[PDB]
């Protein structure tokens, strides 16, 4: 699809075998949800860097589907106040910016 | 242009008379820049959230050109670690995600 910004870029995702929605943000190096649960191997990692850092589980190579288009990549599990798709899943979507 | 997403979508601007640089973010609704120096009128806004608030200067309607492409937006001018250009101002120079 092509989206424009006059509203926030929100898609609807499937992971870990739930529905759920994220935000297209290509000023978000990873991809960081909230409330999924990933089977197969984690390992910690320290995001953010302002205020403290904040705690997450990686996961590699996780399948998510993101507005129908099926892909590979690593997510972040953990607190974040919205979920967020960031540049590494929008690379493998083939998501560009145009204008 | 069309901007791939492998890197950080950083782009040049020009405004107040300087030649800049600021990351093009989707996951921001409003555009903010630090060290630069508009003239008329501002009014205080808090924004962020997370911790406390931050404070900065809102201008409206600064001209600004963005890889080359000359709008009008607000600005605000104060502190963040990075400059960027929210969806207030991709709007303006007509940018969309594509996939």
């Given at each position: 699809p092509q989206?424009?910004?006059?509203?926030?870029?929100?898609?609807?995702?499937?992971?870990?075998?739930?529905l759920?929605?994220?935000?297209?943000?290509?000023?978000?190096?990873?991809?960081?949800?909230?409330?999924?649960?990933?089977?197969g191997?984690?390992?910690?990692?320290?995001?953010g860097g302002?205020?403290?850092?904040v705690?997450?589980?990686?996961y590699?190579?996780?399948?998510?589907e993101?507005?129908?288009?099926k892909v590979?990549?690593?997510?972040?599990?953990?607190?974040?106040?919205?979920?967020?798709?960031?540049?590494?899943?929008?690379?493998?979507?083939?998501?560009?910016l145009?204008?």
């Open positions: 989206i424009t910004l006059w509203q926030r870029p929100i898609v609807t995702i499937k992971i870990g075998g739930q759920k929605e994220a935000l297209l943000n290509t000023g978000a190096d990873d991809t960081v949800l909230e409330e999924v649960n990933l089977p191997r984690w390992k910690p990692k320290l995001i302002i205020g403290g850092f705690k997450v589980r990686q590699d190579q996780v399948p998510i993101i507005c129908g288009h590979i990549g690593t997510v972040l599990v953990g607190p974040t106040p919205t979920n967020v798709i960031g540049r590494n899943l929008m690379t493998q979507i083939g998501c560009t145009n204008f």
